[PDB]
Design a protein around this ligand. Structure first.
Ligand SMILES: Cc1ccccc1-c1cc(NCc2ccc[n+]([O-])c2)n2ncc(Br)c2n1
Length: 287
């Protein structure tokens, strides 16, 4: 750690404080995060793609663990808050979604999951890129109920199979999260802002209908499924994400399928007609 000068605290992550720092040698500006786990993290050093924030190095000293990452100036949460009045233009939402799906397709091809996608770990630069931060850390360290600072780990983007107690969930959990984020960029409001596991589950059911054996074979057997869940009818997507066009609503509906085996994959999503006219606009960033 003596090789880094901390510039400023840039937030509190799931696992510890996150700092903007400078390599006392190369002058490189990085994000420094204080955190079997060693081997898993070490492997993430090779999982490189332009839409995944680069893991530069791992430092383990005095039984302390520090991860050094490529630095980006802003997160999607702050960008959405700043874009609240007029909303993020559809072409930029589309570019971001397209880029995030490329990041997921790459990681998923290596069987690596994120498991905790949310606007705070989607990072953007001045060039119109967006990247996924903290990919793979969940498997290495787990996803706690509260962060190191006791902050509640959000449930808003959590897939229903996780909430229903599936032990061996898949890459589909990241597609669900990203679908939730897509809807939030379009409407300017979180899709399912649950404040407990049951409220999260019931918010999903109110919008998508209570799942049953017809739409999700096997759901009634899952560990935390209860026959006493209320039965809500499914809403039309035209009501849920106006004024998104039919191509976007079609893709969203596929990213939010209940049955993880039938939920669209990142690779298939990239081929969806919604991306026929995709471009890469540049956002207006005020740093
Ligand atoms: C992903 C995450 C979760 C929680 C806290 C920080 C982070 C977080 C935030 C950023 N940059 C955005 C930012 C925000 C505020 C000030 N400055 O200078 C930059 N970065 N940049 C690379 C990583 Br890797 C990272 N992780």
């Amino acid at each position: 750690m003596e090789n880094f000068q901390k510039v400023e605290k840039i937030g509190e992550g799931t696992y510890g404080v996150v700092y903007k720092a400078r390599n006392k040698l190369t002058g490189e500006v990085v994000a420094l995060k204080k955190i079997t786990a060693i081997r898993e993290i070490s492997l993430l050093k090779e999982l490189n793609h332009p839409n995944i924030v680069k893991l530069l190095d791992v430092i383990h000293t005095e039984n302390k663990l520090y991860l050094v990452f490529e630095f980006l100036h802003q997160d999607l949460k702050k960008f959405m808050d700043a874009s609240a009045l007029t909303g993020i233009p559809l072409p930029l939402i589309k570019s971001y979604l397209f880029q995030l799906l490329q990041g997921l397709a790459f990681c998923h091809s290596h069987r690596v999951l994120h498991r905790d996608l949310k606007p705070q770990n989607l990072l953007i630069n001045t060039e119109g890129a967006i990247k996924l931060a903290d990919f793979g850390l969940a498997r290495a360290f787990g996803v706690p109920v509260r962060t190191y600072t006791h902050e509640v780990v959000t449930l808003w983007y959590r897939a229903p199979e996780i909430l229903l107690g599936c032990k061996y969930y898949s890459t589909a959990v990241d597609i669900w999260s990203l679908g939730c984020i897509f809807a939030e960029m379009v409407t300017r409001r979180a899709l399912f802002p649950g404040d407990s596991e049951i409220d999260q589950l019931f918010r999903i059911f109110r919008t998508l209908g209570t799942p049953d054996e017809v739409v999700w074979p096997g759901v009634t057997s899952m560990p935390d499924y209860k026959p006493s869940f209320p039965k809500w009818a499914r809403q039309d997507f035209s009501k849920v994400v106006p004024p998104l066009d039919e191509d976007g609503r079609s893709l969203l509906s596929q990213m939010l399928h209940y049955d993880p085996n039938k939920r669209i994959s990142a690779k298939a999503a990239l081929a969806h007609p919604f991306f026929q006219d995709v471009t890469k606009p540049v956002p207006h960033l005020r740093l």
